[PDB]
Design a protein around this ligand. Sequence first.
Ligand SMILES: *[C@H](CS(=O)(=O)c1ccccc1)[C@H](CCc1ccccc1)NC(=O)[C@H](Cc1ccccc1)NC(=O)N1CCN(C)CC1
Ligand SMILES: *[C@H](CS(=O)(=O)c1ccccc1)[C@H](CCc1ccccc1)NC(=O)[C@H](Cc1ccccc1)NC(=O)N1CCN(C)CC1
Ligand SMILES: *[C@H](CS(=O)(=O)c1ccccc1)[C@H](CCc1ccccc1)NC(=O)[C@H](Cc1ccccc1)NC(=O)N1CCN(C)CC1
Ligand SMILES: *[C@H](CS(=O)(=O)c1ccccc1)[C@H](CCc1ccccc1)NC(=O)[C@H](Cc1ccccc1)NC(=O)N1CCN(C)CC1
Lengths: 220, 220, 220, 216
Amino acid sequence: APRSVDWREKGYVTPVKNQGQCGSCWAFSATGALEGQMFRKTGRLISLSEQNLVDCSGPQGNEGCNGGLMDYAFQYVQDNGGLDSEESYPYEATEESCKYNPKYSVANDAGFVDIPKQEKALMKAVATVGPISVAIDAGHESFLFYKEGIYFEPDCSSEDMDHGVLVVGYGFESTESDNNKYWLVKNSWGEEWGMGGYVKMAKDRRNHCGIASAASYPTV
Amino acid sequence: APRSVDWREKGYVTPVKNQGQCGSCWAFSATGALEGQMFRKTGRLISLSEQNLVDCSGPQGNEGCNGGLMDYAFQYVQDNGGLDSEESYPYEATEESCKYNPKYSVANDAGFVDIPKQEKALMKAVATVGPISVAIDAGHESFLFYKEGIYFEPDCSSEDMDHGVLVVGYGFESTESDNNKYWLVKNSWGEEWGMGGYVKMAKDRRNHCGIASAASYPTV
Amino acid sequence: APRSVDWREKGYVTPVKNQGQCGSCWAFSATGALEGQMFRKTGRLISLSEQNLVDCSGPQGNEGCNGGLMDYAFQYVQDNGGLDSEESYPYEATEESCKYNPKYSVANDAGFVDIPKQEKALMKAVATVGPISVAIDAGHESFLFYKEGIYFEPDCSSEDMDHGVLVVGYGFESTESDNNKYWLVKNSWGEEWGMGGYVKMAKDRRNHCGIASAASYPTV
Amino acid sequence: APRSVDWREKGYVTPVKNQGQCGSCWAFSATGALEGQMFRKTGRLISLSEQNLVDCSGPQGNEGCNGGLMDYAFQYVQDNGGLDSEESYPYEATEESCKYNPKYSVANDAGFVDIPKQEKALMKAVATVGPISVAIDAGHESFLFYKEGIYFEPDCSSEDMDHGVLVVGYGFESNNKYWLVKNSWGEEWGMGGYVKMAKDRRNHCGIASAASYPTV
Ligand SMILES: *[C@H](CS(=O)(=O)c1ccccc1)[C@H](CCc1ccccc1)NC(=O)[C@H](Cc1ccccc1)NC(=O)N1CCN(C)CC1
Ligand SMILES: *[C@H](CS(=O)(=O)c1ccccc1)[C@H](CCc1ccccc1)NC(=O)[C@H](Cc1ccccc1)NC(=O)N1CCN(C)CC1
Ligand SMILES: *[C@H](CS(=O)(=O)c1ccccc1)[C@H](CCc1ccccc1)NC(=O)[C@H](Cc1ccccc1)NC(=O)N1CCN(C)CC1
Ligand SMILES: *[C@H](CS(=O)(=O)c1ccccc1)[C@H](CCc1ccccc1)NC(=O)[C@H](Cc1ccccc1)NC(=O)N1CCN(C)CC1
């Protein structure tokens, strides 16, 4: 795998979005991964509807603003035969009745891939697939307050995660250092948070915050 | 809860045993769970005597090679004040008169805990307690020839279990059908059955084969 | 197409063979497809010589134990006007000079058909033609160690195939509505590999492992 | 010696591990043997760091994912004064700079013992010492494809071995005696990651030709 990857430079990544006061991180993680795989397959980046997922993917196990899983969202898109664009089905930050319209569907998948629980496997997937949905332990105020640098939280759990985000790349401190490698992570808390909405998470430090424990992407 | 658990890596689990042609699965389930809880307490992993349970726990309700319940076994160990080591009271695969000797007792318990009949509760117990005794519907040919992968039997019953086994963890792996989650289950049919004597039972598929319907562990 | 196909039950397929430590998979894929089409034409199944292809089809672009293409093998049979039987020209697992003898030729073809690169087209061809030559990404340890069930490898590529094999059918496991679908694939690593030398490969997951990317059959 | 031995039943053996796509078998053989001897000495079974060996035992002669010797790994632990736990220094399946931390050392050794190149000597060692590091000729597809039974490969070499593994016991049919061998290719391979190798058949696959264990 290359020593660094940034899928934003290849056109796979939409701008940073903001879930608001709704626990819909899973939907933003899922649309991010499906935006990337649709671009891989079609050469077109089209922003996708988190509201569609919040309102409509209950049958696959999701619970709207009360939480969900990226894999359930990927299952919804398969079962449903499509997913509407962000433009056609804009985000409201609260759960509503489903208003899916197939005429505005711009994405599809045939299931999903769960990556094995190894940071080496996550690296290979980021390098060769595109942006990857991951879950992390973001339940520490250090994450809430993050502004810049390589995020490392001594109390982070590698097994108990609470926040779905999107790995769009990875990098290093210098070509010859094992220190302060990082995953480049797109969050969904707006661009004020962090580094324009992004965080560099510690990479190859014993699966820090569980970033490799629930990594997946849709089959496209 | 954690997305993956394997108590074998923490030292809680003895090697796979073989009940032979005796219907004593309940006793192997019980010794497995007690081995785990005793290790949790003392840091010593000591294989426990299934024969002691087969021969001696009739008063609690068990019926030797003709079946029994893990909770009855846990009750016996409490009522009896002890349980002999496997080395001291070896397995003969046929019921005989009770030969318990307190001098060779290496385990105790103070009762047991029954888990609510939901896979969500079983997962919380596995994640926080250790290996858990469970009963499954194992009366299908597919269960005999199992070699690898996630076991799913469409004819499996969630209410009528016939086999006591031990959940030592859970996890996931990508599959064709995207039913990726499994319980890691220790069987007592020897190393040549299944994956070194283990089976990955379908997890979060409507309580498949009843794995969450009679789950419990001893209190140590 | 039919819901399931197994050309072995119709007499189209020879026993599993073993290429040894020679990169001649392409020749075994090609003989398998030609064995099927010759059976379709004549009603007689005759095992065909991979060694003939390894030794003789260089002019069409093949490179013996260093790799080849099934289409180049079909072109050789057409150019050459024949291919010898396995019995007359047995397999040696190393490249040698060409000893084709037309007296022992038992097959011919008039070219080949490349199937469109998607799995609906591949299924139609398997259902209406017979066994189909395909290439897959077999370059993972999971493939070496495959035992039973439907092979799904998260890191499988749909573009970078390295191994020529033979699709002899397809079908499904479990309840049909679970979409637990597979391709039935004959390998050439002997009957100790896999399921008697066969593997069930993930079907209808967007061309998993590239099984539809280089599919063809000979015209007889 | 006893007719059969299985050190797994005595608590000497950690679960099966997976070296991945790195030629670090020697390091898994070494940690396996040191795990057994550390348990023999202390009563604690603690998984040990193959990555520590891969990254750090170059001065003893090892070459990371490009190969090594179990004896060189045992020499490193002695020279270094310790070896980190698996938990503190987990496996990355690629060679990097050495990150050994003495505060997380959980193992030590005082050298190593090479066993004479005879299966009778190997049996005595397994019976009296615990799990033994060995090297075998695993360069045959029959070994890649192994699933069950007593492994025997007519083309195996007794002198040219390429794979470090761990003998955790031995047994008998009731002919076809076997060594119980723990591999490091994960649980799917073989019998839950184990293989029964032919025992007392002219040093099949060289299993007695490079056997050793650490002194603790
Ligand atoms: C989003 C994370 S968050 O809201 O942005 C947040 C806030 C502060 C700190 C950290 C993170 C949601 C939050 C859901 C929630 C709502 C209300 C109260 C508590 C939580 N997180 C999830 O949806 C997680 C994501 C996840 C994915 C994969 C693996 C692990 C976690 N999932 C979740 O909460 N679930 C999952 C399943 N089920 C359908 C409901 C519970
Ligand atoms: C072990 C199961 S088994 O023998 O390994 C087996 C074999 C083949 C297929 C599936 C399982 C025993 C079998 C008892 C038996 C022997 C001979 C004829 C009929 C039955 N199973 C039990 O002991 C079960 C386990 C169990 C525990 C908890 C909840 C549900 C089931 N229990 C059991 O059979 N009994 C009968 C008598 N006893 C007092 C109460 C429960
Ligand atoms: C057989 C595959 S294999 O040897 O059985 C194997 C072993 C282990 C894992 C996976 C597969 C050959 C291998 C050729 C090879 C030899 C030595 C080093 C590297 C490779 N594979 C081929 O022959 C492939 C098959 C193929 C067909 C169609 C599309 C894609 C792949 N072709 C190949 O390797 N070529 C083709 C062209 N040219 C003549 C040589 C390179
Ligand atoms: C592990 C064996 S393996 O990779 O798992 C494997 C794979 C397939 C089939 C069989 C085995 C390593 C492999 C090293 C390697 C990597 C890349 C290319 C070639 C080789 N094997 C070793 O490390 C062996 C083990 C050994 C120990 C004792 C006696 C004999 C063999 N040793 C080795 O390769 N050395 C020794 C010393 N020197 C430092 C480098 C070469």
